[PDB]
Amino acid sequence: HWGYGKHNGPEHWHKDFPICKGERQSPVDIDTHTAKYDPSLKPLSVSYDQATSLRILNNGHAFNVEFDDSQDKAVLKGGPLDGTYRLIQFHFHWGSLDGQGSEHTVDKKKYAAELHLVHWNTKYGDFGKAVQQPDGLAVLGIFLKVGSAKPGLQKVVDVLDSIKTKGKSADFTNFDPRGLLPESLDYWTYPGSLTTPPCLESVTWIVLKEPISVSSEQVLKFRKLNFNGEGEPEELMVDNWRPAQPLKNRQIKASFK
Ligand SMILES: [Zn+2]
């Protein structure tokens, strides 16, 4: 099956998932000099006050912190978006070293990790339906750099020992995703795809300009997770990022000058 190894990584995905070579794939390099300020973009609206987290799961390619998306409780709207998008889960991509890990890059710069807060368009009723639509998902992407600790991440870091291996889940209630946001909501936006198979081209990407800082100890604990199941040979869950894909016929817009 697909993964991030030598024999099943991103360069192989297209054999089972042809859309992975499509016209609007993600991530991309964000060339800050060619991105265009678009004064028509509205401010982003992140409304996470009533967010209800439920669970954290190691699914063999990352860990997802999952939310109750059965009501409008944690929603993204505004910016480039029409209508309302509900938070379903967040996860990260990270490296084996601090010098890599992000999926998007900024003038070719790779960050140590990248956070994806995944939201689906309520006009489609559920995530499964939404993910098949060209405007079905909105993903807020946030870069992580290593420096000072992010206090709001620590509760995530501390539960990772309980979900070391693929298929393990743990109760994870009352986690507040607002503690993962930077100060500024300035962003770049472009139309793209899931960055994991099936690579569906259903995503409005909203990538924040301001990274959050996490500590070396925090990211080190990400790197102790396993891609494998319990009782299978240990392979550390590191470098679970897809590299930048060709921009092709797209323009990245900036919300800021
Ligand atoms: Zn992701």
UniProtKB/Swiss-Prot annotation:
The active site is at H61. One of its GO terms (molecular function) is zinc ion binding. It comes from Homo sapiens. Its cofactor is Zn(2+); Co(2+). SMART domains: Carb_anhydrase. Keywords: Acetylation, Cell membrane, Cytoplasm, Disease variant, Lyase, Membrane, Metal-binding, Osteopetrosis, Phosphoprotein, Zinc. Catalyzes the reversible hydration of carbon dioxide. Can also hydrate cyanamide to urea. Stimulates the chloride-bicarbonate exchange activity of SLC26A6. Essential for bone resorption and osteoclast differentiation. Involved in the regulation of fluid secretion into the anterior chamber of the eye. Contributes to intracellular pH regulation in the duodenal upper villous epithelium during proton-coupled peptide absorption. This is Carbonic anhydrase 2. It catalyses: hydrogencarbonate + H(+) = CO2 + H2O; urea = cyanamide + H2O. Its EC number is 4.2.1.1, 4.2.1.69. Activated by X-ray, histamine, L-adrenaline, L- and D-phenylalanine, L- and D-histidine, L-His-OMe and beta-Ala-His (carnosine). The keyword Cell membrane applies. Changing H61G: Impaired activity, not rescued by 4-methylimidazole (4-MI). It is found in: Cytoplasm; Cell membrane. It holds the Pfam family Carb_anhydrase. Changing E103D: Normal CO(2) hydrase activity. Residues 1-256 form the Alpha-carbonic anhydrase domain. GO terms for cellular component: apical part of cell; cytoplasm; cytosol; extracellular exosome; myelin sheath; plasma membrane.
